[PDB]
């Protein structure tokens, strides 16, 4: 009973959320009544507005699926060039179906669940004059106050139509002050929180790279100016897509605000011949009346239960050692096992061999050749790759008694070096525009994933590689964006191709731990997460910058989803030096903790063995827990996060001091998410009531430039 | 168990508030641990701060009664010039006593309560080197999360000492960003909300008029920057005193924030002989975790139950007509009766004869004579006052069946014109400093209420006045401040004298309704509310500006306390013209509604009689309800307020549109303080569930420059 | 012609600044007309305000030397306790004198300059009811758009009066939007800039430490909200004083802003006997139409030419090496010359020996003893100080061809350790109040420089 229909009124109800709209019986249009906290029974109806000037009634109404060209001058949710040449569209309400459960999405990733968790309402619209059908899906996950929307356009007429713009979700907000929040950045500085007041006009962001990108994440929050991490109302919107996107928030002339996200319209000219369908990616929306933090927590649980489909979603990740920053391209067989021996002796459970192992006639010994020739380099692995992997997966793991090392590989299958066998044979496989110069970025071109020859090539080399040795982890990287495209249709076709490859491979190998990567967080979106349980958060591995990067990423994605590695100092991207315990502690807030450094360059083997044990102790709370961002790194120099177990029985507090704090009081960190009337023991010593820990909190001083603390709480 | 003592740790616990401090048995000083939401059990003690530079450990701790001159460079709560001439002080903890209930305050107003409602802790300090004792009082009314503080300085030495500064209340806040709210204004624009961020250094306000004044109220709130009317943490402070005052917030070098209110130091040089005691006025402190509005509602219930002692605190006030703006000084018997007849024909139940009735040799026919001679003027009342009061109180009140009109009268006892008989006889009764010019403001001088002669002059002519006719209402005005004073001691001795007078006269005539006044809200403070159940809010009677003034005043004081009169247009202070119903709806939010105009100038009698019955209908909810300031006039042009019966059966909503709203959406006003799962009938028609009225709201449109609605809610 | 008197009107003109006030011939008060960019000729006069409520006309005018207790409820520049107990004060204009140049300030430091650089106007007020006089000094340095103000209070009566508050400078601003700027900090973080909007009520900062302190500097700027380092109008205020101070800015109920800097009224109870005078420190004040940095550059030029009297104001400073953070207390003769040789070897031309060279019976080998015993420590300097300073001043400096190392030394003359000979000989020389505990900070007490014995002790051992 999450969905109630009364006449042409449709109500979707969650625990503390309600989304209500109706079809207008006169115009056929879908009008929004309410999206926010629970309502029930009769709703007040807005008094009819007085119409003067150019903006008629259609411009003063809250519209669910708005079009342009019949009186509404606000930004549209859809633009269709009709066969006869018009960009007009009069899609009216014809009927609806309610369905328990949630139907899949053809070729696209989507949240899932069965009838107990999710209900779907499909609303059918039809344009009589042009014979175009639209099919608006709405799904409720009531436990998480989540509304999931998508739209289908089908051409029923005799000629072609072109879809020039198609949003996955369009909500009109009433007149009120709003703040917009998003994540903006670039390589080595992803996911920085920005917050801005919504003005009259358009404001928003998107990606033109063909991927969701480092520059803006396909995610944004509308909140009241007074909304904080723990108080007030916030609406979150997250596009479940890895290609390009456009997110626009428009405060219209009349004061109503239109929020919409979906395809990037400048990379979407989708011709639909007769009978053909275009399906938009899904947009997840979460309402919270408990602040922005409350919205994140519902996203985190929703994605952990109903989107991340890998068996690792709630499993704990083995501490790993990645060879990249320790050795870069300069290695072979012997280095890889010296790395694997030394790793095992520290207690590490998975050794990942990064870039540099492949190619034959043009070996991958640098940035400049070999991508596409995915066989092991015989200069580096003269006996093949399987004798190496077998010796490595018998190294016993220190302090474990029993378990043997695991092995993981790096690949980058969508890319090709001009200097390779692959490009010499099949130069027609890359993305290009006629004779236009084929511009490189990091000396590589992008293979065209819209070709079935390309998709099968990838499915193949990956299948043969994973069946040649005992490989239980794959890092799937992608180190540039799209430039020249054979046509605008190719942006979306590529993704339908990429999703076919990720669905096939992840289903063929469900026991592989798959990690997304794209020069770090270049494709950190819910599209990838459907197939891969974790993503490399950023190439910046400096402890200070990662605090910001991880607090920003967590705004939408669960911490269990973030990889974070302890790196060497001075940092290779910032030149900063930061203490080891501080670096290690920042990395334990990631789901997949690891080391990215030559295990000999570390002097204190006990300190890092102690830290790895600490990492394995906190990991269950980061994987399954609830994130409470207590103090933001953008608000002060003492950021702090708390992870509360599902059941409330344990918690861990990460507390940081970033600058030095010379001759000054320190703040108190107040906790939240605890039971006020319960008692908690702090780090095995003092015992406090929950109310005290939440209402007065704790205070830590340091006498260093950097400080960190990891504190455990046990109920009772 | 509202007060709890363990060792040297004192804890005061309200329902959702806690106040915890302790004595340091090494230094003897009182140190604050927590003032905020409920704590219990063991509290985390702060790590010891490293000391560097000139600021010693005393400059780094939260103190409860801080002195200066022994290492703390922050603003002090106390300054004592000792007999030998030092300004050093070292008051060390000596002992304490807890008792149920609350002792009275000698010669001053204070909150009062019985053993169930309030518990009191007195802490004793003593200075061994100078023989000075300080006794700090803390009372908890746990139902209202209120903490009432006051302090005593007793000189136990053998020479004199001088109290150069004595703060009633002194709280030290941990290092955290705070915002300071105050009320500022002047004549005809009192109580304007101001909100600023607390900066390193000193900010605050006070009064040097000798009264609490129009310029700043003795009231302020510390809030987090994110705190709103309904979200987050607020700490309120209100001085129960009608004299000068000083309020100061200081963020010290180390980052802790000190807040203190009490006497204006610059008008406090209080010599204490051997065995004498100075008693500060009480300061009432409220904490809320439900926003600034939650803080107000606790204040309002506290003052209505434990401060306003008059029998009218919970009784409804009769709609009255005041004669001032209708007739000013130009009248006689003939006109007063004309105003009274038109009053009762309209349904007005009380008629007030303002300025202009008194003086004989020097008649009060203008601003310039007669203040002091408090007998009726024979030119205007040839047969005395009693026969006119007699004919006035026989007039029956329309639409009432039975009840007859009541009579009230204006007085300004503390003042004298030089052109009067009293001044000619007792010119030394006035405030003055030797031979300095006796400066006038509105042609009057102030009587010295520190003299018992002047006190008994006022007590006697008011006793004789109130026994000379049928007077059931007195408006007690006060139309200037103190200028020259015979000594600094006279500032506070005047107030002790005025309180003896107000205490006698209001105990002696408990059935008179007494209204305080001072060119409006020039003495609008808890000190006067102890004796008077209501106060003239402002001389500005303009509808638009009274919304700002009444909203600001309600920050501290209950709407039951606020007098508000429908006035004539064009308005005599603003020249603004506002429709009659708007003007009335604004006045109905005052506890005492009335007309202040010539009724000859209003020509729609059925409308006025219809607004007076509406005023009587809403008056019970304004007197006894809880106020929710739904929308502030500072934030938007649609201010709104909600009065909810204390038991939830009923509510009334005042909703205004101030500017015109040309060609634009209207906002949604959302209610609060209802039962989410209850049903409410809105204005006898539609029926909505509490959650709907609170999470969706109502929308009102107007096609006018000014619009207003009073809407009633009945539960089911 | 930097100062122009016309009747009871007074104008101070600078290159790009004007300061105009006048004497109200009915009330006797000084009223401010303009303080800002250049004006000249007739000035528009403000239309008289309409008076209602308690704030009479004195509370609606811009006042140069405002008192409280006669109708003005704004924060005052002067509070005086009369012999008869009143805290009232009716100071009325009497006359004035203009002189070229600038006279000295008795006992205090002050700007200086010759007749071409500064002109001074002195305004005399007198309260006939209590026999008290004031003298308000105005000095223009026209080339730097600076106005320097100070005030005298004289007791002309037969009993004592007490000055309870006395600002050096009091300007009343018109109804405008103003920002307030200052420097705040503590040890190891001095002089962080701060900028807040001026609000109704009082805002400011001061020092209670007896010294101008790390916590707030005796300096503040008022400027428009849009004023930057290079655009907009700014008014600077600097108190020429090392003691405690108070700085208050107050937006009155009528919207005029009062700015006042001077003594800390909480550490000023100055009894004046008959004939006695109290002089306030001066306040330098600078207007700039060219940003906050324009104002700074004017202060910097003014101070370097008209305040800093040492011959090193315009001279190059020798690169030095101070031994504190390199050696702390742990040294003797041997290390001090190792440091001095290595300094000369690097091209450093001045070597400074910091803390730890002094004391004998209780030597300065730590924070805990010795301050007060200002002779070299024999354990550390067997043959005394001068054989070492002579070897040290004979090192040649690298890359200089000629020059010799110079020697410098560290003293803390106003302090004393309880653990010292001085404190054992003269325990009453320290600041204390009767029998109250003599609290320490870094194990030291403060010497009482109000005592002539202490001043001569200091002057003599420093001279020796």
PDB file of N, CA and C in Angstrom, chain C residues 49-80:
ATOM      1  N   UNK C  49      16.415  67.907  13.031  1.00  0.00           N
ATOM      2  CA  UNK C  49      15.606  66.693  13.174  1.00  0.00           C
ATOM      3  C   UNK C  49      14.362  66.932  14.018  1.00  0.00           C
ATOM      4  N   UNK C  50      13.344  66.135  13.734  1.00  0.00           N
ATOM      5  CA  UNK C  50      12.126  66.140  14.532  1.00  0.00           C
ATOM      6  C   UNK C  50      12.333  65.249  15.754  1.00  0.00           C
ATOM      7  N   UNK C  51      11.985  65.769  16.928  1.00  0.00           N
ATOM      8  CA  UNK C  51      12.271  65.130  18.209  1.00  0.00           C
ATOM      9  C   UNK C  51      11.004  64.464  18.733  1.00  0.00           C
ATOM     10  N   UNK C  52      11.084  63.164  19.035  1.00  0.00           N
ATOM     11  CA  UNK C  52       9.994  62.463  19.709  1.00  0.00           C
ATOM     12  C   UNK C  52      10.546  61.404  20.652  1.00  0.00           C
ATOM     13  N   UNK C  53       9.769  61.081  21.688  1.00  0.00           N
ATOM     14  CA  UNK C  53      10.229  60.107  22.665  1.00  0.00           C
ATOM     15  C   UNK C  53      11.268  60.675  23.621  1.00  0.00           C
ATOM     16  N   UNK C  54      12.180  59.809  24.062  1.00  0.00           N
ATOM     17  CA  UNK C  54      13.112  60.180  25.123  1.00  0.00           C
ATOM     18  C   UNK C  54      14.396  60.821  24.614  1.00  0.00           C
ATOM     19  N   UNK C  55      14.801  60.493  23.393  1.00  0.00           N
ATOM     20  CA  UNK C  55      16.060  60.956  22.835  1.00  0.00           C
ATOM     21  C   UNK C  55      15.819  62.381  22.339  1.00  0.00           C
ATOM     22  N   UNK C  56      16.234  63.367  23.126  1.00  0.00           N
ATOM     23  CA  UNK C  56      16.119  64.749  22.707  1.00  0.00           C
ATOM     24  C   UNK C  56      17.158  65.146  21.676  1.00  0.00           C
ATOM     25  N   UNK C  57      17.343  66.455  21.485  1.00  0.00           N
ATOM     26  CA  UNK C  57      18.188  66.936  20.400  1.00  0.00           C
ATOM     27  C   UNK C  57      19.663  66.590  20.608  1.00  0.00           C
ATOM     28  N   UNK C  58      20.128  66.512  21.860  1.00  0.00           N
ATOM     29  CA  UNK C  58      21.535  66.190  22.111  1.00  0.00           C
ATOM     30  C   UNK C  58      21.859  64.771  21.648  1.00  0.00           C
ATOM     31  N   UNK C  59      20.869  63.861  21.664  1.00  0.00           N
ATOM     32  CA  UNK C  59      20.980  62.499  21.175  1.00  0.00           C
ATOM     33  C   UNK C  59      20.822  62.325  19.683  1.00  0.00           C
ATOM     34  N   UNK C  60      20.706  63.415  18.925  1.00  0.00           N
ATOM     35  CA  UNK C  60      20.501  63.353  17.484  1.00  0.00           C
ATOM     36  C   UNK C  60      21.540  64.155  16.722  1.00  0.00           C
ATOM     37  N   UNK C  61      22.571  64.649  17.398  1.00  0.00           N
ATOM     38  CA  UNK C  61      23.609  65.461  16.785  1.00  0.00           C
ATOM     39  C   UNK C  61      24.939  64.733  16.898  1.00  0.00           C
ATOM     40  N   UNK C  62      25.840  65.058  15.983  1.00  0.00           N
ATOM     41  CA  UNK C  62      27.171  64.482  15.984  1.00  0.00           C
ATOM     42  C   UNK C  62      28.044  65.322  16.907  1.00  0.00           C
ATOM     43  N   UNK C  63      28.569  64.712  17.967  1.00  0.00           N
ATOM     44  CA  UNK C  63      29.255  65.443  19.026  1.00  0.00           C
ATOM     45  C   UNK C  63      30.740  65.093  19.098  1.00  0.00           C
ATOM     46  N   UNK C  64      31.595  66.123  19.231  1.00  0.00           N
ATOM     47  CA  UNK C  64      33.055  65.936  19.290  1.00  0.00           C
ATOM     48  C   UNK C  64      33.560  65.405  20.631  1.00  0.00           C
ATOM     49  N   UNK C  65      33.001  65.868  21.744  1.00  0.00           N
ATOM     50  CA  UNK C  65      33.449  65.461  23.080  1.00  0.00           C
ATOM     51  C   UNK C  65      32.222  65.196  23.944  1.00  0.00           C
ATOM     52  N   UNK C  66      31.492  64.117  23.663  1.00  0.00           N
ATOM     53  CA  UNK C  66      30.186  63.912  24.303  1.00  0.00           C
ATOM     54  C   UNK C  66      30.269  63.388  25.732  1.00  0.00           C
ATOM     55  N   UNK C  67      29.427  63.962  26.592  1.00  0.00           N
ATOM     56  CA  UNK C  67      29.185  63.491  27.950  1.00  0.00           C
ATOM     57  C   UNK C  67      27.823  62.808  28.047  1.00  0.00           C
ATOM     58  N   UNK C  68      27.637  62.058  29.132  1.00  0.00           N
ATOM     59  CA  UNK C  68      26.383  61.399  29.458  1.00  0.00           C
ATOM     60  C   UNK C  68      25.735  62.001  30.707  1.00  0.00           C
ATOM     61  N   UNK C  69      24.428  61.814  30.816  1.00  0.00           N
ATOM     62  CA  UNK C  69      23.712  62.355  31.951  1.00  0.00           C
ATOM     63  C   UNK C  69      23.062  63.709  31.755  1.00  0.00           C
ATOM     64  N   UNK C  70      22.915  64.180  30.510  1.00  0.00           N
ATOM     65  CA  UNK C  70      22.160  65.404  30.255  1.00  0.00           C
ATOM     66  C   UNK C  70      21.195  65.247  29.084  1.00  0.00           C
ATOM     67  N   UNK C  71      20.869  64.016  28.697  1.00  0.00           N
ATOM     68  CA  UNK C  71      19.965  63.744  27.595  1.00  0.00           C
ATOM     69  C   UNK C  71      20.521  62.814  26.541  1.00  0.00           C
ATOM     70  N   UNK C  72      21.841  62.738  26.401  1.00  0.00           N
ATOM     71  CA  UNK C  72      22.472  61.848  25.439  1.00  0.00           C
ATOM     72  C   UNK C  72      22.652  60.489  26.099  1.00  0.00           C
ATOM     73  N   UNK C  73      22.077  59.454  25.500  1.00  0.00           N
ATOM     74  CA  UNK C  73      22.206  58.110  26.029  1.00  0.00           C
ATOM     75  C   UNK C  73      23.263  57.286  25.296  1.00  0.00           C
ATOM     76  N   UNK C  74      23.995  57.883  24.351  1.00  0.00           N
ATOM     77  CA  UNK C  74      25.071  57.199  23.643  1.00  0.00           C
ATOM     78  C   UNK C  74      26.336  57.120  24.508  1.00  0.00           C
ATOM     79  N   UNK C  75      27.206  56.167  24.175  1.00  0.00           N
ATOM     80  CA  UNK C  75      28.423  55.956  24.972  1.00  0.00           C
ATOM     81  C   UNK C  75      29.259  57.237  24.986  1.00  0.00           C
ATOM     82  N   UNK C  76      29.699  57.710  26.149  1.00  0.00           N
ATOM     83  CA  UNK C  76      30.376  59.007  26.233  1.00  0.00           C
ATOM     84  C   UNK C  76      31.889  58.926  26.087  1.00  0.00           C
ATOM     85  N   UNK C  77      32.476  60.080  25.762  1.00  0.00           N
ATOM     86  CA  UNK C  77      33.923  60.223  25.730  1.00  0.00           C
ATOM     87  C   UNK C  77      34.533  60.568  27.090  1.00  0.00           C
ATOM     88  N   UNK C  78      33.754  61.117  28.018  1.00  0.00           N
ATOM     89  CA  UNK C  78      34.276  61.533  29.313  1.00  0.00           C
ATOM     90  C   UNK C  78      33.248  61.185  30.379  1.00  0.00           C
ATOM     91  N   UNK C  79      33.725  60.661  31.506  1.00  0.00           N
ATOM     92  CA  UNK C  79      32.938  60.527  32.729  1.00  0.00           C
ATOM     93  C   UNK C  79      33.742  61.135  33.857  1.00  0.00           C
ATOM     94  N   UNK C  80      33.131  62.044  34.606  1.00  0.00           N
ATOM     95  CA  UNK C  80      33.822  62.703  35.702  1.00  0.00           C
ATOM     96  C   UNK C  80      32.951  62.603  36.938  1.00  0.00           C
TER      97      UNK C  80
END
